[PDB]
Amino acid sequence: AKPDGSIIETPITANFREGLNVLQYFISTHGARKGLADTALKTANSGYLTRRLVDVAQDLVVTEDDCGTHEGIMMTPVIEGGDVKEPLRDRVLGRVTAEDVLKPG
């Protein structure tokens, strides 16, 4: 990307094993500076977000073993388009069923 965050017409056609032309390194510097500023800002904002989330969630402690609540959530493998993004196998692990599952047949 270039300043304004758009891709340059001519790529950085040089490797690091081979040399970099002055203009190529100049262009590459934009991305590095952008990334470093992004890093600092994201560190600060992540600290703030951790703070707000901790403040909202801190007064929450597991205190009972079973409340008998047969209520629960439908819990499905997330699929977008043709591709299954995540497996229900991953999700189901570590949960407790709200009903007694049956066979698909």
Binding site: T43, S46, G47, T50, L93, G94
Partner: protein, 210 residues
């Protein structure tokens, strides 16, 4: 206005709650320490456990007063090394990264007294600490009452905290060097010295390779 300042009740959050019985130092790698161990400089230990050392010294009768204990420790005599080994036999310590962004950011370890001036952190734990070895400084604290020590041992130590508390799954995964060693050693070739024979268990595999 004295009810509330920043960031709130002064003595329970910022600012600024600096606490004693703690230290801070740059970190080095020790690839000989076991997973429940951290390499801690001898001077750092000597100045982190001065009260415990004084108690032991007056317990053995080696000192008759606090002044004698002070002289005894400052003279750096060989006797205090046994005293410090005793008070550090299994007394764990708590290492916390300067930013703690997840639960593992602070973990307990068993300290091994080492020469040098840096904290020898377990290589396999630094990935969990989300730290590196670039001059960044780790911080040690000593849970110094019995019950805090046991809270450290049962919960704080890296042995009992190996899975990420974010998604489960081990957080103590080999990261960059040991994984390279294993990937090299377990690779195969199509022809090399020692090809094709049969060996009595990995006994003879070790014997023949070495």
């Amino acid at each position: 206005d004295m009810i509330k300042g920043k960031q709130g009740r002064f003595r329970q959050n910022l600012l600024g709650k600096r606490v004693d019985y703690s230290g801070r130092s740059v970190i080095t790698v020790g690839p000989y320490l076991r997973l429940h161990q951290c390499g801690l400089p001898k001077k750092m230990a000597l100045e982190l456990f001065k009260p415990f050392i004084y108690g032991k010294l007056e317990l053995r009768g080696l000192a008759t007063t606090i002044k004698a204990a002070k002289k005894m420790v400052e003279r750096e005599e060989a006797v205090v090394w046994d005293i410090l080994d005793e008070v550090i036999r299994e007394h764990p310590v708590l290492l916390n990264r300067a930013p703690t962004l997840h639960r593992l950011g602070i973990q307990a370890f068993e300290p091994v007294l080492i020469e040098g001036k840096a904290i020898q952190l377990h290589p396999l734990v630094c990935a969990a600490y989300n730290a590196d070895f670039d001059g960044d400084q780790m911080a040690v604290h000593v849970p110094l009452t019995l019950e805090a020590q046991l809270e450290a041992r049962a919960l704080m130590m890296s042995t009992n905290n190996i899975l990420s508390p974010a998604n489960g799954e081990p957080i103590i995964v080999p990261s960059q060097d040991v994984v390279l060693g294993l990937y090299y050693m377990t690779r195969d070739c199509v022809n090399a010295k020692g090809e094709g024979m049969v060996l009595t268990g990995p006994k003879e595999a070790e014997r023949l390779y070495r």
